[PDB]
């Protein structure tokens with residue numbers, strides 16, 4: 001009969017700070033109850049009307065988060081294997097949700113930033129192999145399936161067969177190899193054999209593969225209207241939806257006889273969308289991961305660059321086009337030599353023979369008053385005015401100064417500031433997301449997406465037909481031992497601080513004056 | 518003598534000098550056979566590159582060049598992020614523009630040239646405009662297929678190039694130069710600046726500790742130059758075929774003990790005059806004062 | 812900072828109050844003339860300038876809804892732009 005959890009839930013719902021901390025320190029099952037307290041307080045703080053009381057609830061939820069961090073830090077510092085059984089324990093509080101899922105739902109990013117939690121996610125990622133095996137041994141065992149039964153891959157953190165092919169690293173590695181073979185087949189169809197009359201054998205293999213990828217995205221979109229709200233929420237579910245919609249528009253346009261070239265180009269832009277998927281597939285990796293995350297935070301500085309450049313590119317381009325007006329005055333021709341010459345001049349392509357009379361041969365080539373010169377090039381105009389050409393050379397010099405020295409070196413300065421400012425928060429965000437990415441590979445039907453139709457048939461058939469108790473007591477008493485040592489050391493550190501020594505001296509001198517008088 | 522072979526296999530530059538000599542033996546052995554002259558002629562060229570990169574390890578002893586050579590190998594994870602993001606973007610751009618204006622020379626190494634090797638040189642300022650832009654090419658009925666075609670200039674650019682939707686090829690050039698030359702290069706400078714200012718202090722601490730064993734290596738070497746070093750190896754082969762004062766140490770150690778005692782007395786005075794131990798001693802004096810009243 | 816931390820609407824009526832001291836000059840104009848740059852750096856003052864900038868719409872309406880309503884004047888009378896501050 002331990003009713004301490006009823007008084008904990010009572011003190012959390014009425015927002016009593018000192019009550020809820022005391023009721024935490026007396027009850028058991030402490031790591032899960034601190035994550036449950038942090039979750040419940042943040043849910044009720046978003047639902048709060050008064051601003052001061054929502055601020056009060058977010059301060060208390062931050063206190064419970066730091067206590068679960070400090071307690072699990074000491075439980076991990078004693079024994080790694082036993083603390084691993086402490087996090088991964090089924091349904092400690094309020095339904096089947098482990099401590100990692102309570103840390104995920106509460107947005108407790110300081111709990112995932114520990115070295116103990118990241119070590120347990122590394123052990124979970126490698127399955128039932130050892131987490132120190134190098135990646136080349138994983139590659140040699142992957143491309144040689146009989147080489148599993150040797151002394152390269154040490155196990156224990158037809159049995160070794162499902163110890164190799166059951167780990168999340170080999171579901172990842174099989175997914176990457178199958179996705180690169182999809183791109184290699186896509187490129188072979190698009191660059192070598194794309195017949196105008198009838199689709200060949202290799203293109204029908206491509207259409208079959210894209211049907212398997214479509215059924216995979218409906219399986220992650222259904223396996224029901226709130227689930228569609230969740231699939232519409234992400235940006236990369238929308239991007240894989242975007243790749244498949246451009247694919248259907250390309251194949252549907254190709255099959256009509258009057259629209260061959262339109263589908264021929266829509267599939268090329270579709271190839272770019274499928275290859276940018278690979279930036280999201282490798283966010284699970286330990287070295288490439290966090291750096292891919294920081295790239296999307298560097299895009300407000302690129303947009304300042306494009307703003308300042310487009311103001312300056314219009315100013316330079318229309319001025320030099322007006323100064324030496326040419327004789328080919330088509331609309332796309334002048335849009336070429338207004339926007340597209342100066343954009344390539346900031347990358348080192350400076351055409352001097354198109355806009356400088358000293359490099360051109362003169363002549364009476366126009367039908368108008370004035371002196372004219374004949375440029376070289378099929379797009380540079382046909383005759384160019386010679387009046388005030390030193391001003392065109394000065395506008396080139398000023399353009400190269402402002403574009404290549406101000407804007408490029410200032411952009412390097414802004415990228416350096418933004419990077420050193422957001423780098424720490426991007427590490428904290430990546431570790432918290434690293435749990436749910438691993439859980440995605442562990443929850444996937446482990447069969448490669450060219451051959452994944454087998455598992456979708458089996459799930460279609462199933463859709464047509466519709467610790468021990470003493471081990472938990474030993475575990476929780478072990479946790480309560482370390483909770484008491486944590487709280488005693490916290491009390492000794494507060495008592496030996498300098499300000500409470502100053503309080504205790506002040507009260508002793510005050511009672512000394514009470515003894516004299 | 519087998520544990521010494523474990524030590525020689527342990528280092529990376531003992532392995533590299535082993536690597537230079539193994540490529541040398543493969544080059545000389547291939548040269549002497551009559552049917553393999555050109556193979557040894559090229560293996561010795563790559564071997565020349567491996568011998569010249571030794572000079573980066575010889576000058577880690579130097580006082581100015583030393584620590585900076587050490588920091589260079591710690592900057593290689595950011596180069597590998599650059600090569601990852603670039604290869605994703607280089608395949609995306611190259612296969613799209615090759616598909617959009619399909620050419621008529623469709624050899625395998627020819628299309629691998631103009632898929633991987635054109636865009637890699639476009640990030641260094643080599644932008645060939647007359648090979649992929651219909652406004653700069655002369656048109657003509659140069660193919661044997663339905664559609665409008667144009668004839669590029671260059672022996673590797675294809676022979677006929679499709680004119681359909683060429684404004685999309687010009688837009689893919691503009692987007693490529695934006696992502697490659699502005700994002701990836703300026704972001705790489707930002708990551709090198711962060712990594713450098715983060716690992717610079719630990720690389721100084723590592724270099725000073727290694728600076729002892731490098732000096733000891735030159736002091737332990739037979740001092741005769743490696744063109745003429747056969748003399749010292751003959752002399753060591755002959756030798757292999759045939760098989761302070763006490764009062765000065767007492768004065769030294771008593772001098773050390775004098776400075777040990779002054780060090781410990783100053784450490785005790787600094788701890789005693791600190792503010793927290795003054796606060797302890799006042800607290801205990803007031804407590805014994807209450808014991809004297811009561 | 813504390814008057815804003817209690818109630819946002821009532822502190823908005825506190826800054827924007829006509830002629831509190833020495834002629835018609837509100838607290839924002841006294842902060843402007845004094846060069847009090849630490850007073851404008853608050854999150855309360857910048858939130859009230861965001862509400863003043865958007866007029867009598869809501870300050871959370873995205874810019875594309877403003878563009879669609881600008882280039883389609885009959886599209887004002889729909890449920891895109893929520894009014895009352």
Ligand code: NA
Pocket residue numbers: none
């Ligand atoms: Na440059």
